[PDB]
Design a protein around this ligand. Structure first.
Ligand SMILES: [Fe+3]
Ligand SMILES: [Fe+3]
Ligand SMILES: [Fe+3]
Ligand SMILES: [Fe+3]
Lengths: 211, 211, 211, 211
């Protein structure tokens, strides 16, 4: 039935990504922000179902902002949690992603040059938004999205990094560069490799965990 | 059932607004452009229903552009045809709208100053879009919208003027100023008065004619 | 010469707005965020000077986002600091704004009902942005802007409230409703009255303090 | 000096692209639309120079829409005329672009599949806009822009196709699919090859013809 999303459990404990991301941020980010996207998405979807059945197009259009924002919220965060992992896990080793890192090096020259390019895009975001490594056709691209806009246009998301201030401010204050530098330690390259090899639908299977 | 919109008949013949708007434009604008919005809206709505029932949020967000564009298309054109009428009709006489014209004069000083102000907004639109007289709270405002974006945010639409090039180009070429000057002759002030007296829901009842 | 903006001093100490806004936030918000908008604006403006002299239109257009973002940043924050004051100051008393509060009560019914309307708009902002009371013509309107977009389209800014997460997160966490509730306590109604009685250029004279 | 742009002559007579594009459209498109962008750009730039020298940021931001719209107008149309040519010219033969067509086949599989992809993108534009083949890094990409937004973000424009209704409506009416089918005959693949082989600066040197 429509609008039965729930907050999925994290793949790890709230303090599992320290020192890169504090337990305080993880708990707030998950239990509060992600939770709010779930609740407000469900409310919008139930309202939309009525308007859709009634062929009430004005109400449907007026509901789009709530669905894109909160729906994008659960999409982006579902992907986000899955492509993070504890620094001690083997999945944080980029050796877990031989084909992806091979294509990264082909495209940007090296993994370090890619990290530099990605960092620049993340720090260049004006306001709230996300940075993404995506697969487009066979090639890789760095893209950013504003607010909670998701990567649903056709590309395969490989991994994303949240640049909303609530993702880092309590720990890094205005130092978003330090946040980005440290998040590399907790990137889940096993997840990234799997998405790189799969297609768009494969990548979004994770959303089933929220239903 | 979902997606059963049809093209409503015009309140007048295709040549009824000459010389202000040619019969060629009216026929193309109605039988082709408005028709296409109807057909593509219905298809998008049915596809959305599938995604909504499946809680497929990525597909829903990807469909929003088609629903807003084609849904706004049928909304704006339904309102547009209704607030046009033959120049010889009494409804084109602004005396048909005593309360609205009184509020216009209170707001812009006179009807002539409003029309001049409105023209400036219409001619200032970059690309495709619409100009609207709307009621917000108790006051009147001139607003513009891009492409087929409709006035569904809460304001009451009073009347709109289509500034897409297909609304005038065959007859006026690049002379959109002449188009605007001549469309005043075929504005349906009876409709404008009715919407001014009603609320938001009242104004959109015209959409029932497309179902 | 082009691009000689500097960070203006606050009208009060960093801890002067406590308990509504913490000294930590004020210092970070002013010395870091506002400072960065100043620095990046000056550099963008100088780069623009090069492009204008060269009639390099591609470069000019590519620079617009940096000028709007950082230029809006210094505009919005200059206005922001000026329309805040200590809760103990007489200027925080809305009695300091007889004409404005009369028009507010005229417009929304009462000051409390206006505060309710404003709060809803502020809390409805998706992502980063600002809420503004503005004077348009003779009437008052609540408007929101995204990111650092400023109110430069013609309205007279009366007062603004920053809803970027860096404006409240350290103190209120995700509780933006509590932030809004408490910021009313430090609104400078003397400033608001002055802007309300003046025109657009009058309101932006404050920018001279940054030159 | 600032704001001394002029309308460059076409590389051919107004009727040289028939039957693909009528002489009536070419004359209106060039002598009227492109001319207006030139005039309104010059006026915006002269006003901007004053605001820039005065560090008047509000005025600079308020002028951005006019500079982007009219500046993009002259950029896009300058490139547009240059990448069109008579259907009988050898430059209209894709054999004139061996390196480009080779990369196209690598990217989309074949020239026909690229044309199919481009056509879909062009016909999918909502409202006014442009479709572009661009070079990003070493790869080719199809992108669309709204209104007169130009491709100034870093990519090298290879060729563009105007999808504003004034580019085809007088001749094709609502039949934009027929317009796209026929414009392939007058694409200047010699020009496209040169841009593909050059860098971004190389591509925009054509603007010098407007000074
Ligand atoms: Fe987040
Ligand atoms: Fe239309
Ligand atoms: Fe701020
Ligand atoms: Fe054009």
């Amino acid at each position: 039935s429509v609008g039965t999303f729930s907050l999925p459990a994290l793949p790890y404990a709230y303090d599992a990504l320290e020192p890169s991301i504090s337990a305080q941020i993880m708990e707030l980010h998950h239990s509060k922000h992600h939770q709010t996207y779930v609740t407000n998405l469900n409310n919008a979807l139930k309202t939309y179902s009525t308007a859709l059945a009634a062929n009430d197009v004005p109400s449907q259009i007026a509901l789009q902002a709530a669905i894109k924002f909160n729906g994008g919220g659960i999409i982006n965060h579902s992907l986000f949690w899955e492509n993070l992992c504890p620094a001690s896990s083997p999945d944080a080793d980029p050796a877990s992603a031989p084909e992806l890192t091979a294509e990264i090096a082909k495209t940007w020259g090296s993994l370090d040059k890619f990290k530099e390019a990605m960092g620049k895009a993340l720090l260049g975001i004006q306001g709230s938004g996300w940075g993404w490594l995506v697969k487009e056709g066979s090639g890789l691209r760095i893209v950013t999205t504003k607010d909670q806009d998701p990567v649903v246009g056709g590309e395969v998301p490989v991994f994303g990094i949240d640049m909303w201030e609530h993702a880092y401010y309590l720990q890094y204050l205005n130092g978003k560069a330090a946040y980005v530098d440290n998040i590399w330690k907790v990137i889940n390259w096993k997840t990234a490799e799997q998405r790189f090899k799969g297609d768009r639908e494969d990548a979004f299977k994770i959303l089933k965990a929220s239903l």
